[PDB]
From a paper:
A prototype of a Gram-negative epsilon/zeta TA module, the epsilon_1/zeta_1 (ngε_1/ngζ_1) TA system, is encoded by Neisseria gonorrhoeae, an obligate human pathogen causing the sexually transmitted disease gonorrhoea. Thereby, we identified a yet undescribed enzymatic activity. This proteobacterial zeta toxin phosphorylates UDP-activated sugar species at the C4′-OH group of the hexose moiety which eventually causes a lytic phenotype. The toxic activity is inhibited by co-expression of ngε_1 antitoxin, corroborating that the ngε_1 / ngζ_1 locus encodes for a toxin/antitoxin pair. As expected for a bona-fide type II TA system, we demonstrated protein-protein complex formation between ngε_1 and ngζ_1, which assemble into a heterodimeric complex.
Since we found UNAM to be a superb substrate in vitro compared to all other candidates which we identified by small metabolite extracts, we soaked UNAM into crystals and determined the structure of the complex. Indeed we observed a strong electron density for a UNAM molecule positioned in the active site of all four ngζ_1 polypeptide chains. To our surprise, Asp56, which most likely deprotonates the substrate before nucleophilic attack on the γ-phosphate group, is in hydrogen bonding distance to the C4′-OH group of the hexose moiety of UNAM, substantiating phosphorylation of this particular group. We observed a number of interactions between ngζ_1 and UNAM and nearly all residues that form hydrogen bonds with UNAM are strictly conserved among homologues, but not in authentic UNAG-3′ kinases. Most importantly, Asn75 and Lys59 form hydrogen bonds with the 1-carboxyethyl group of UNAM which could explain the preference of UNAM over UNAG by ngζ_1. Moreover, Arg181 and Arg175 form a positively charged patch in the active site counteracting the negatively charged phosphate groups. As expected from our initial, qualitative in vitro characterization, these measurements confirmed the apparent KM for UNAM to be more than 10-fold smaller than for UNAG or UDP-glucose. While this value is rather similar for UNAG and UDP-glucose, it is increased by a factor of approximately 1000 for UNAM, suggesting that UNAM-4P should be the predominant phosphorylated species also in vivo.
Author numbering:
A (entry chain B): 2 to 395
B (entry chain A): 8 to 60
Write the structure that this text describes.
Amino acid sequence: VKLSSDINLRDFGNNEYLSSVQDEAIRFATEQTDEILSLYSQHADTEGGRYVCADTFKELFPAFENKEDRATVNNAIHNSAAVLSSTQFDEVLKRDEPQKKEVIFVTGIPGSGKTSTVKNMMMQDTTKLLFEGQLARPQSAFRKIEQCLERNLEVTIVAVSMRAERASDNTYKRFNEYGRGASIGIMADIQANLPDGLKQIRDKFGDAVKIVGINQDRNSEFIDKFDDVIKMLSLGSQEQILGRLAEKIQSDFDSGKISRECFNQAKGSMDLESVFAKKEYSQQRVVTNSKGVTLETKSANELWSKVEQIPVTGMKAGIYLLGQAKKAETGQTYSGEIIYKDAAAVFQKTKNGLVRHNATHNEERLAKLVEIGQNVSIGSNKGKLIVKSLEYSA
Amino acid sequence: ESNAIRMIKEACEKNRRMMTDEAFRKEVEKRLYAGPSPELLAKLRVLWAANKE
Ligand SMILES: CC(=O)N[C@H]1[C@@H](OP(=O)(O)OP(=O)(O)OC[C@H]2O[C@@H](n3ccc(=O)[nH]c3=O)[C@H](O)[C@@H]2O)O[C@H](CO)[C@@H](O)[C@@H]1O[C@H](C)C(=O)O
């Protein structure tokens, strides 16, 4: 049994460990295909190889054995696991089994309970195959659906859905317990682009492919009609979701709700500073007084409503429009009182108006080095942060 | 309705039982992401060890 396709190499660059783990993985998958698929079918918890999934195939790789290594090696082995799952998909279809007429695809963001929902499905006499995998970039799924239709099999696509935040909590637990989490980059990518991929599938195949949903925010509510599935899944753009997830994993790390290892796996290869800089504070202002600071947002009706209040002593009265803040240029020093900060930004009132700093600066966390109400100078010498206090009594 | 759609709906009920019944949720989530079993892991070590370079 040969692999169904070639395994795409990723560029790891200077990390030679992952570059070697990738090559060991591709060699294994390519050369020991017969025996890998046999162990997948006859011996794993996979309904005799009918539950087909790239994640379950990762367990058959040596680099994936210890929980400590899984998050690190994941991206180096994944494509080998995915092509193995694709090969397995085809081998199950090759089995002449006239009774078995149904193929089910399960898709959704990591942490939404796709696999737990598949465990809760009871196999039937007509169930031929069950494939868990992303359908947000559906090019590869077109080939799978195509060869299901060639054999007059009934294709059903189940889109499991959940908020990014609740889904991210589920990956934290799964990482802490089993070393297997999910990156924010891929969580945002899947959730943002899944509506497009399902419509792409719907437009190409029509009624030949049945598309249903599971809303895990509404007590696992079944969604029959395709138009309702698209409304459920439309939970923001990739920029919004990635932005919200970036702020979430950072806030959870700063509060001590997750470890540094659970943070690094969730972050993955994202430059969080780059994400935070994209965040917009138009239609937003901070009102200061002797009691504290108050974040307010303005809606279309020209009304400010309170979003957040932080008690702080020693501040004068002021209104600061966060959308009109000048981005801090690198190299220079900005001296003034910190009027507001969050997971993304730090706002400092200088003599030349309100200045905005990114809360991270070259993997170095600015927000924790300053407090709201504190008078400080912030400057970066050779990409290295210098924060001095300017507090005095006289 | 097809068998598949019925199977999915029945899975959604057991997803709802996971929220109330805590003894059921721990029975489900124990296996899932654990890793290979000792029997499978024994077979795998022979497979990996027989094909080193
Ligand atoms: C988006 C992505 O890369 N990976 C995600 C996707 O895997 P999956 O759908 O199995 O993988 P694929 O790369 O989207 O591939 C899907 C299909 O594409 C063909 N193919 C894949 C790779 C390749 O080199 N050549 C090639 O031809 C092949 O037919 C395969 O079945 O969906 C899973 C949902 O259960 C996620 O857990 C997984 O992310 C976790 C966190 C992770 O990334 O580690």
